[PDB]
């Protein structure tokens, strides 16, 4: 079987990383952080690796019940929640996973909503409120099956009953909220397991490509963004066709459909990330019809035109 | 963001052979990639040699065939064995998990009959 | 030529294409009385998508735009664009612009903005898809908070959608009552057909999600045609439809036994031989074989 | 919740023709489908003849040949043509957008 990407532009993808669309492709040559982001992993024969899964609605979403309210001194109402894995089963610890499928990979105040629907009734209770994940936390332990949380309300949480957390946001990216986007979390709270593997470019040259969305704060001042190896959809694509890769280096054309011609060019790794030779930083200024195509198989010496 | 380090570069003869030795400051089991690079007195950085985790390796076609690019299985250490070195392949050897990591001191190679 | 296919997806691999939720249980309800005309989720199997429906799992009942105005009841007006930023163009033969959402009810959700380092803000807010200042066809809404200051003019703004704030009979949740897109009284235009039932014996066939609720009692649900994923996949194939209806088999993935068959007509619907209401008693990870093409009148076995 | 009537029936001889028409309080072209049924006694209704949004047909393969549907879409009327009718067309005939949409009284055809 072809290896083939989906006919998708810009407009048309989200992030694999936060639900979000994508709003820019975007380069950061200078960035020497460790890139090894667990969502949106995904091999070109269409192997899924980290946590990857394949829902949009499951990428950085919880599901579980909460067990109690818990001191805490701090400003705001604090509760611990068992974590289940997203189809509601009980998460096994000891899964060669690094947490449940769908948990976040960055460091950071998450930003969401937490509901309830009760499970006795004939009709039963809801609830559902703001609610803030810091994944830097040693409470943070979604490999264990626990996480906690925070409300700005203080009472209006049920114990012993479903519960969904809804990610929008960031709540905050001043100093005291340790967003780093490439900064994974102590999953355990431990060293971390079964993690998929670092990224970088190999040839000299070249830095990674990344599909950027924009995450919404709920205050303070920034202009956060979330980067991914590939959107959801080429994660969706490559595992639904789970095609042969026949070397380590897919050459792709990003190409303009109205012209016909390619705007640039990039390196597709058999591990699921692009390359690109670019020697600058920011946004890709390219036209918003535009899409990447499979040309062919090559390895890690075949030299890119810059872009 | 990864510290590196290598060494057993020297002086060889021509014909002769050097193994090289990479350490690095986390798993290199939890890189994508390794690779092996070199630079020429007023050269650039060249790809000489990378492998990947499962140990699929790749090569410059003027080493193909006298390199041979591996880990160590018990330590956290990457190697280059170059085999009938040439006087061409003179140059500073560096080790890196990919070029935006900053790069370690290099070992200097020099394939002299002097 | 290119031939005709489904995505192969359990069904906890797939997601609702009219609210951002997984799918949960598939679903009949012969008894109905409701005209079934959806907007969203709407898909050709030769994949022309139809009504309000676009690709992004994102862009399910999400709104995109700027805060024009603070307008008893605190509200805002807000111009809404396409979900790609640009300006939406009321004479486009579609009901709303891609994304609208296709049901009355109080759909409640978080919106955020980034002033044009910037300033931001996040607020909890309800949007009434039944009022008559619901009119994205026009290129405006409204929407509320409960907060009553901290929403910026002018600036960029976005609605995330989270679930319904009530059920309670005041709040006039309908999943098949379609919002009036061009505000009170006003022809909605270019509609996905309605769907029904051809054969007799035979039900609509829906993917369910349950919604969740911002307060108050009750277990509400969405009943989408096809899943997004489906939506998706038909779109990128274009696979030419060679009859009115395609015979499908919802099949056990590790042993390939057939569970149930059913139709899946060429419009984008479900049907099957059932004659009981409520939640299909199957395996979650089933999925959805195309077995051959076929007619309306092909006779299923019952389920 | 849409009102169909529909009417044309009669007797007729073998061999014979009828038109059967059916008028919908609703536009037809909102509407997936429109189809033919009928039913005879004792028994449960079966489908006929089914024409689609665009103008596509079927047909049971007991009136295939001898059978057409038609629509009038800016009329709102579907249409029924049958010739060479046989004494097994006997029975009511209704057309409905779908099954699960209330019926009309029908129309008896009798071929005798
Ligand atoms: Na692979």
């Known amino acids: 079987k072809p290896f083939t990407l989906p006919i998708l532009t810009l407009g048309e993808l989200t992030n694999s990383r936060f639900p979000l669309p994508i709003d820019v492709l975007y380069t950061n040559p200078n960035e020497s952080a460790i890139v090894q982001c667990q969502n949106g992993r995904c091999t070109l024969d269409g192997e899924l690796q ?13 599901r579980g019940k909460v067990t109690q309210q818990v001191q805490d001194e701090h400003r705001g109402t604090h509760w611990n929640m068992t974590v289940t894995n997203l189809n509601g089963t009980p998460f096994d610890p000891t899964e060669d996973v690094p947490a449940p499928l769908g948990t976040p990979d960055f460091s950071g105040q998450i930003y969401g909503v937490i509901s309830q629907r009760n499970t006795n009734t004939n009709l039963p209770a809801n609830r559902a409120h703001e609610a803030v994940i810091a994944t830097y936390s040693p409470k943070f332990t979604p490999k264990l099956g626990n996480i906690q949380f925070s409300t700005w309300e203080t009472q209006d949480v049920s114990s012993g009953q479903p519960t969904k957390f809804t990610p929008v946001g960031l709540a905050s990216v001043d100093a005291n909220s340790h967003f780093d986007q490439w900064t994974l979390p102590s999953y355990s709270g431990t060293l971390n397991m079964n993690l998929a593997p670092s990224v970088a470019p190999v040839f000299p040259g070249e830095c990674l490509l990344f599909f950027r969305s924009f995450i919404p704060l709920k205050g303070g ?50 591990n699921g990330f692009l390359t690109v030779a670019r020697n600058s930083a920011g946004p890709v200024v390219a036209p918003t019809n535009g899409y990447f195509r499979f040309d062919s198989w090559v390895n890690q010496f075949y030299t890119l035109a810059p872009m | 963001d990864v510290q590196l380090v290598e060494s057993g570069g020297g002086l060889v003869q021509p014909g002769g052979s050097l193994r090289l030795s990479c350490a690095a400051s986390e798993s290199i089991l939890s890189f994508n990639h390794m690779a092996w690079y070199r630079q020429g007195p007023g050269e650039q950085r060249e790809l000489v040699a990378v492998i990947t985790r499962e140990g699929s390796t790749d090569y410059a076609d003027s080493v193909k065939g006298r390199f041979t690019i591996s880990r160590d299985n018990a330590k956290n250490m990457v190697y280059l064995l170059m085999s009938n070195l040439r006087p061409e392949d003179t140059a500073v050897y560096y080790c890196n998990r990919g070029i935006s990591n900053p790069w370690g001191q290099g070992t200097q190679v020099t394939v002299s009959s002097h």
């Not at chain 1, 980290?50 to 919880?62: K, V």
């Not at chain 1, 011609?261 to 058999?270: I, V």
């Open chain 1, 50 to 62: 980290g946590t990857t899964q394949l829902l949009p609605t499951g990428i950085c979403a919880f």
């Open chain 1, 221 to 270: 001042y920034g202009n956060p963004a979330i980067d991914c190896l590939m959107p959801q959809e080429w994660v969706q694509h490559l595992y639904q066709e789970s095609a042969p890769s026949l070397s380590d280096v897919a050459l792709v054309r990003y190409v303009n459909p109205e012209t016909g011609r390619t705007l640039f060019e990039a390196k597709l790794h058999r």
